[model samples]
Target: LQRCIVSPAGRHSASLIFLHGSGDSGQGLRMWIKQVLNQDLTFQHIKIIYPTAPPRSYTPMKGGISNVWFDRFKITNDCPEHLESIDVMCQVLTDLIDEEVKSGIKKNRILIGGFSMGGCMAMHLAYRNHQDVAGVFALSSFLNKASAVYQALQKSNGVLPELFQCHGTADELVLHSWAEETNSMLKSLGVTTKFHSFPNVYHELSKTELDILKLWILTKLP
Candidate 1:
């Protein structure tokens, strides 16, 4: 439960919950502020919560020490097991949001965004939680096992969240095509999504991408 806070213009009452990419820890997420958010916008009241993922191993990574939701189990779109994990994670996040709400931040003003695996979780959880989330930023992310993801979305009555999705055209790890497909699926569901692609960037964020994040956060604040 690590965090990086940025107070807004008055009595700090808004928040942004950030989830990090696989292999990343809470320590690095604050870089978003120094590199983009803070530099471009005035957040004298917004607070950022960057939670630390429990440690787990991914078979694809050959047993690396990194943040993970669960032990690798042949992850795929709408994976049954992955969706179960999402359920668990959503419960935890909902509780976290509850605490923030009790502390003064309005539920509708808190945002959720993440990178890679974290990004996927944020988007899907917002749909499932249906807590009137402000918005979500999905960067180089994807939909978990398709079956489970589809089922959850249907069960939630198709919450079309405001989404900021970005991916690199040259990304080999998460395949740019996957991001494109996700954008299409959410669009079909009537989501107001702003999709971006980096022509030659790899599976990582670029300066322009960070700038866009800053702008989106500022513009979408509720």
Candidate 2:
């Protein structure tokens, strides 16, 4: 997969690997961040990564190809599909994280996050490899295969990382209730979680949500 990394002039103190939603490329995420968040010097100490998903045949799209983190037939109650998707993408992401570690970055100085389909993988990655990251942000995302994700987490004796989840109450793509359930599950598993809900918001990200994300990210800076 093609990847883009945004870094500052000086040494890197932290890293953030962000994934794009389905049908979007790494450049899409890079453009959004450069337009909305990177204009300022707030991320000077951080190196941000935009990892592109490989194009694959999507079942929902009737075998049409799209850039997606995983394959899925529906949004919810698809544990089998979700597990396979996570297994494939998680290996790639884990390799990326390992590469960063080998390049002298500490595991605790890294964070993984994304939007929609990307966020789903971020949450699953954090749950399975919690010991290697500082925190995870899942924006407008859900744990549709909650049971499968939890099972993966149980297989590991790793420490839990902090979590930040934001969702739109009126989101039609991913339900708000699912976010609530994910939050509850994370907290029950002894992971620190921050859940935010926006009134009258949809599946798209908003300026207010970006502002909140900016603040949350600043707090995670090492």
Candidate 3:
């Protein structure tokens, strides 16, 4: 459960908790975010956190151990294996949010986001903690276990947070069509969602895509 915290040289206005994808570490995501923010002076007052997932054997990796939010039997539209993991990680995020609140940061000033599996986790946590987060950013990701997500939405008390989902048209790991279905599902749930598609892009995030994400983050910041 090691984490990396990246921030400007001075006091911060907002906080962003970003979870790394499977097989990735908090430091890896921290480095990536640092690169994206290096020349962007606008986000100098923002603090970004990268949390690493626990290592476990995954079937997709032929039982090889890697950092994953959850273990899966298979990757499909219905992510049945995500139930327990969702609950576990949501608590971790809750603790993080509580820590931020204790430090004088408002709940609405905190955003949750991530890449791939991490992206799905972000969506789940945002929905479960709808009232606590300002927004969600899901890059190269989708809504896992749609029925469960829909059920959780019913428990939310306040307005749902805004979400930005971006996927590669040529994503080999997670099909673009599946991601579209996720977008439709979220819209049906009365959530504000903006979905972007990258033509010929693979599973990885591109510089142009990062720019778009930065713009989205700017809009969410106070």
lDDT of 1 at 144: 44
Better of 1 and 2 by TM-score: 2
Tell me which residue pairs clash in candidate 2: none
Candidate 3 C-alpha lDDT tens digits along 106-178: 8889988899989888887788655568899999887655456777776655689988999999998889998
Candidate 1 local lDDT, 58-168, one digit each (tens): 655787766764444554443344555566777877788888989977778888988888887788677766538889898888774464545555555544569999999
RMSD of each: 2.8, 2.2, 2.2
TM-score of 2: 0.90
TM-score, predicted candidate 1 vs. hidden true structure: 0.85
Summarize candidate 2's per-residue lDDT along 13-89 as a digit string, tens digits: 88888899989998887787557654532477889888999999888788799999988867674444557777888
After superposition of all CA atoms, the RMSD between model 3 and the true structure is 2.2
TM-score of 3: 0.90
In order, what lDDT does every prediction score?
0.73, 0.81, 0.81
* TM-scores for the candidates: 0.85, 0.90, 0.90
Candidate 1 residues lying further than 4 Å off, grouped into runs, are: 32-42, 62-65, 70-72, 75-81, 145-147, 155-159
